[PDB]
């Protein structure tokens, strides 16, 4: 279900459904465009992690909590100079609230089944 996140995240990057960042998370959750809400963790965030929790636990918005910020940043495809090898250095993104119009996907239902229970 991590390679499911990879596909849904890239079918929202490519087709530009996601309202990426916490300011644009606040946009997508005030307009209520959130079909999902991805979250990275283990960063010195006393108020920031409660912000996304109380926003997501307001009405209907789901929650994926991955561990590392840099890891979500390396998935969300920001900084890769010399693609032949490894990404050089990528900023740690937290809240990439996907409004996935591209449901032409295998990975929509398997994440929706991981949220069904």
């Amino acid at each position: 279900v991590n390679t499911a996140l990879q596909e849904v995240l890239k079918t929202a990057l490519i087709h530009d459904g996601l309202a990426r960042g916490i300011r644009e998370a606040a946009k997508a959750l005030d307009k209520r465009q959130a079909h999902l809400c991805v979250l990275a963790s283990n960063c010195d965030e006393p108020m920031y992690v409660k912000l996304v929790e109380a926003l997501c636990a307001e009405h209907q918005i789901n929650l994926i909590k991955v561990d590392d910020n840099k890891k979500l940043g390396e998935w969300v495809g920001l900084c890769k100079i010399d693609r032949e090898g490894k990404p050089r250095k990528v900023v740690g993104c937290s809240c990439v609230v996907v409004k996935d119009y591209g449901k032409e996907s295998q990975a929509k239902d398997v994440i929706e089944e991981y949220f069904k229970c």
Partner: peptide
């Protein structure tokens, strides 16, 4: 700057300090 715009509650709700723009071009965002 989003931390100033809102005030997160103990429960799953809001203490939004700032007024939302009552315009057509920009709604509740």
């Amino acid at each position: 700057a989003v931390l100033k715009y809102y005030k997160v509650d103990e429960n799953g709700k809001i203490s939004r300090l700032r007024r939302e723009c009552p315009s057509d071009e920009c709604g509740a965002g």
